[PDB]
């Protein structure tokens, strides 16, 4: 229904002298896979999308720490769009807090707070990426337990590997295969906020950001 | 210095000057600081703030009310200066959000809600950054709560610190623009969910403040 | 009928050290006048102004070496403004050369070439910056050779100081103080183009930007 | 290096990924190129521009068919990185305005308009900015010209680099895309003073390349 961008298992992204990046990460990335700008363009038509579908009204929700950037990005894009109509359009941003832990055996989430501002709203989940579908199917039945008008998630990722499969998502940015990425909205313990594209971590990467 | 100072005198500009949604034609007075012009003081703001604090860690911390566009902003600049260092610097970012009460006849009682691990901050250089400071009340008691868990050093960066003389003389260290003392809305700044669209700091007309009043 | 954005004679612009300047010119320039975002913003609202005026059909009319800063901008605001028509908008943009030099006595000027593309069409002169007005006089007489069905002039800046009063433009960006500005679109002998804002040039960048 | 090469294989990307004008709907077949490509690309090229040109004067002249968006957003990052350097280095910007003949059977054939003192160039670094290359005739019939001035050095950029029969086999020393055989429009590429707001690259599609079409 619209698997968004798909970056293929074969041969995927660029070479990383291709484009502009810190010289600080020159080890610590392997190849590139969605340039910045690139990332932009695709979040733009997704505001497009979400507009169809949304709008009665509207409640963006954030999850917090982690995914600020992307729902930064989305929603400037959305107020972009929201500038035209002829009647000025009520907009609310919300915010849920929300931490993972690697796991023997088991999933481990701590979640959020006070979302009394959802009943009976449209609500958009915005995730970062998608892997194993747990934070989005958390995500879900806790909305789920505050009676909302309706549900949709976007994500600017979707990795291809195996899941539970129980939700998929209804606004995708890219598909990508399945390695570790950073950059853009993703940090490696704090490390490549300043890293605009999306890239695979090395290992030289991996082992110098230690955590 | 206080900013980027706004006078009182000639107060800001005309609102046929800027480009403005029309569905706000009637809702404003005057425009105070257009976008561009945040963007522009916002990027200073940033070296500002790696002068004082580049190199070491820092952790980021936005005073969240209705929205953190300016955190946002101000976070895209740091991080461009820090694409040029030549160790990459872990930059820590976090959030304290701070829900509403009594209106705002004492806005120095915080209700903070998104408040995990605080004690992260012990032994590190917080960054605090706000939107607008008007009586000064909510930094000064979050400043307090702050301190309690022993960072190595706090600074305070506001993009706008309103000129009031219901203002309780609180300082930040970093101020984008000072105002006059009057209600604004745009950017950053929310009006019962309205102006969100809005790119420029202008100040709500009365036509305005009644149709999006709560 | 709008003077655009006036900049007083009295206590004009910003310091210094409240904007972002190139290291480099440090000590070449006075006061900064017109940060570079402030410039954009104004800029946009011109190009929401030119097309209420025209569109028959436009053609934009770039003034060649010097102008090309503020044309290609005011140009990518008025094509962002053309997106959203229901039939898509031809639009031509043309170019003059044209260089000035200092004058003994009379002025000088040297023109330009092929302007075919101008019968019957509407036609925007961009320029820079307005101080004598000579340079805007000369453009003037020159389409008005052609046999244009319409003629407007836009112009980023307006000096205050003494003129023949002759053609007083349409659209104008800025109504700044009788002092030598620098950046953005104005150099000082190939220096300053990396400068994004308007700024006082000082005297020791006078003497250092030799010639 | 060739650039980002953009394969015969899989073209580029359906259209309803990307924010396309209405009023093109039909006139495209693929996006090649979104903008922020172009642009994450062209910044790129423009720090390799000033690591075999930087610090020397450098003449920046745009070859001008229709527009210079390319240019002019080539020019702008070159600038952004010229912000840092110890001494400001003077940028001449110029133009050569070539006026199209025999349609395109033969474009080796240069009608030159815009040559001010074309002496300006001798004993001086030229970078000749471009926005495609397709034959590769024009280019190498410029080159021609300007050589025959006598500068210290020639490097040539193109934002893209057409995969040809046809092409003549002069390569570019900046190469932004190197793309497939297919005629193209969009950020830089008018066609018949159409397509000027389409900031992508797109192929034309016939239905386009018949409505628009002089
Ligand atoms: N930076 C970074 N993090 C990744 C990546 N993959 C997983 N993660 C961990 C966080 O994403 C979890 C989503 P889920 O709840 O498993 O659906 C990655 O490719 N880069
Ligand atoms: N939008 C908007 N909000 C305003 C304004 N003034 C106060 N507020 C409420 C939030 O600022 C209070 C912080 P404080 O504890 O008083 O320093 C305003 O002029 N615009
Ligand atoms: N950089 C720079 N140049 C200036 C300035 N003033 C004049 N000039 C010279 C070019 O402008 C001539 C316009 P005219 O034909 O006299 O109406 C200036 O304040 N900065
Ligand atoms: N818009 C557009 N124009 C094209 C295209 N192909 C050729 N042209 C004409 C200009 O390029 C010719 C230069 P050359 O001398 O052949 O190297 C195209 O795919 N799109």
New interface residues.
Partial sequence: R?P??VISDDEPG?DL????I????AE?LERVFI????????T??LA?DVMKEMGGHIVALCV??GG??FF?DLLDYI??L????????????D?I?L?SYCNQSGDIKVIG??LSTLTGKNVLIVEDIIDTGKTMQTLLSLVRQYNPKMVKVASLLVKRTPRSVGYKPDFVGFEIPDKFVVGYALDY??????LN?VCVISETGKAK?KA
Same sequence: chains 1, 3.
């Fill in positions: 619209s968004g961008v660029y002298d291709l484009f502009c810190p010289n600080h990460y610590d340039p910045h700008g690139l990332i932009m363009d695709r733009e038509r497009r917090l720490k600020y950037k930064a107020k972009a929201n500038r035209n109509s002829d009647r000025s359009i009520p907009m609310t941003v915010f807090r931490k707070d006070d313990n704090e490390y490549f906020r300043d594209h950001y």
